[PDB]
């Protein structure tokens, strides 16, 4: 016996916020599969999935399963594992689903030591560029510390820091976090702290 699984869409699903997406799998199997389901968070997927043979004949060994995800929030993301099995073989394929979300700047405040710190979270892993406004900001500033924190809502969190004594401002420092999706820019002004 055998079960060969061919994913019609990327097993690494980068889908944007609040949008629809189909996890489609076409697989050939013999003998006929008598067990097939979509598992999510160690439990059978709560909504519905279509499931049908490619051809309703007898010489048919091709099958298709479709899972309709709708309006993905940071909550309903993760691993969607499609399971198929017959009398001879158990088979599985996993769809790691990420709601692509531009980095949100969780915090942007001044530390007790004096350093400005910007902690931003998103997916994929956001990079933080520090800028300055001598208004539009173009003066690039070198970060003295950058690291990735271990998260607990369903993404990756990075924090970056700069030397705040260096500023003779009289001005504003821009924290710009970004990734493939979008970009967030927060601003810190020393005259109002």
């Amino acid at each position, epitope marked *: 016996g055998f079960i060969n699984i061919f994913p019609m869409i990327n097993t690494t699903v980068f889908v944007n916020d609040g949008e629809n997406v189909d996890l489609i799998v076409e697989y050939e199997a013999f003998p006929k599969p008598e067990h097939q389901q979509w598992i999510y968070m160690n439990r059978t997927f709560t909504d519905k999935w279509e499931d049908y043979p490619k051809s309703e004949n007898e010489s048919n060994i091709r099958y298709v399963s479709e899972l309709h995800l709708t*309006r993905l929030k940071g909550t309903e993301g993760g691993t969607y594992t499609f399971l198929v099995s017959n009398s001879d073989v158990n088979a599985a394929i996993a769809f790691n689903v990420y709601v692509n979300t531009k980095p949100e700047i969780l915090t942007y405040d001044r530390l007790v030591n004096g350093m400005l710190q910007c902690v931003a979270a998103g997916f994929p892993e956001p990079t933080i560029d520090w800028y300055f406004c001598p208004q539009r900001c173009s003066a690039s500033v070198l970060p003295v510390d950058v690291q990735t924190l271990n998260s607990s809502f369903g993404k990756l969190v990075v924090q970056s820091s700069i030397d705040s004594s260096a500023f003779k401002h009289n001005g504003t420092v821009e924290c710009k976090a970004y990734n493939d999706v979008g970009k967030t820019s927060a601003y810190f002004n020393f005259a109002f702290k």
Partner: antibody, heavy 118, light 110 residues
Framework: SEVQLVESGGGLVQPGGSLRLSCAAS????????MHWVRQAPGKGLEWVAS????????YYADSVKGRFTISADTSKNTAYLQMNSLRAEDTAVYYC??????????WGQGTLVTVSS | IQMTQSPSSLSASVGDRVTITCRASQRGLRNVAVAWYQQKPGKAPKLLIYSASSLYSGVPSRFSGSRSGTDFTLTISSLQPEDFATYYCQQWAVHSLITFGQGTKVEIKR
């Protein structure tokens, strides 16, 4: 980045000639969505031409364009392609590139004009 | 092969109700789903309804879809100026995949 489909490659060609349409996608990746080509003849309704899963490369065609048309996709460029060969007068239509989800087409490019005549 | 969308051309007014029907022909098909699109002159079609009755994000809730053992139906209650165009129906099936209705123009009476 917002969702956009931009068709191109349309023009005026001779019967039996060839042409290659391209659909640039942005705001989303095509490796996740099925991509379709649907044409609209002038004054007429909509006709489904072709479809592809850019990730697997699995392809599907209309009966009237097989052996002549060839849909493909480059995921590295997030772009779809429609290689139209052996063109006929009745292929004269506005060709739309569309995103496919839940058995339907949720986003449409504004199409490119293709005319086949002598 | 094929799909009959009736009727061809209609006339209504703001606050009115428009009903419009699509029929698949016929049996032997699997997992049939039907979508409804709107199209204005010179523009690309927009998805109104998918999976018979599910409304797509953006289109006002005065757009309704339904189905019976015979009919696929799109109905609009209380028209608006931006509700006047041509409306297409498409179907998807395991066999044949994508088919389209002939499209129907809603207009105005006066």
């Amino acid at each position: 980045s917002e969702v956009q489909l931009v068709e191109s490659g349309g023009g005026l060609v001779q019967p039996g000639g060839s042409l290659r349409l391209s659909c640039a996608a942005s705001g989303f990746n095509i490796s996740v969505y099925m991509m379709h080509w649907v044409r609209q003849a002038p004054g007429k309704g909509l006709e489904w031409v072709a479809s592809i899963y850019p990730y697997s490369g699995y392809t599907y065609y209309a009966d009237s364009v097989k052996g002549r048309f060839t849909i493909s996709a480059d995921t590295s460029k997030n772009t779809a392609y429609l290689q139209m060969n052996s063109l006929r007068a009745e292929d004269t239509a506005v060709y739309y590139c569309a995103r496919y989800v839940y058995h339907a087409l949720d986003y449409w490019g504004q199409g490119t004009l293709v005319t086949v005549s002598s | 092969i094929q799909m009959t969308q009736s009727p061809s051309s209609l006339s209504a007014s703001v606050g009115d109700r428009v009903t419009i029907t699509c029929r698949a022909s016929q049996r032997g098909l699997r997992n049939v789903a039907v979508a409804w699109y709107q199209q204005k002159p010179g523009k690309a079609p927009k998805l109104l309804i998918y999976s018979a009755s599910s409304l797509y994000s953006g289109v006002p809730s005065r757009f309704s879809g339904s189905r019976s053992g015979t009919d696929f139906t799109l109905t609009i209650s209380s028209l608006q100026p931006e509700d006047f165009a041509t409306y297409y129906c498409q179907q998807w099936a395991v066999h044949s995949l994508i088919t389209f209705g002939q499209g129907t123009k809603v207009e105005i009476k006066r």
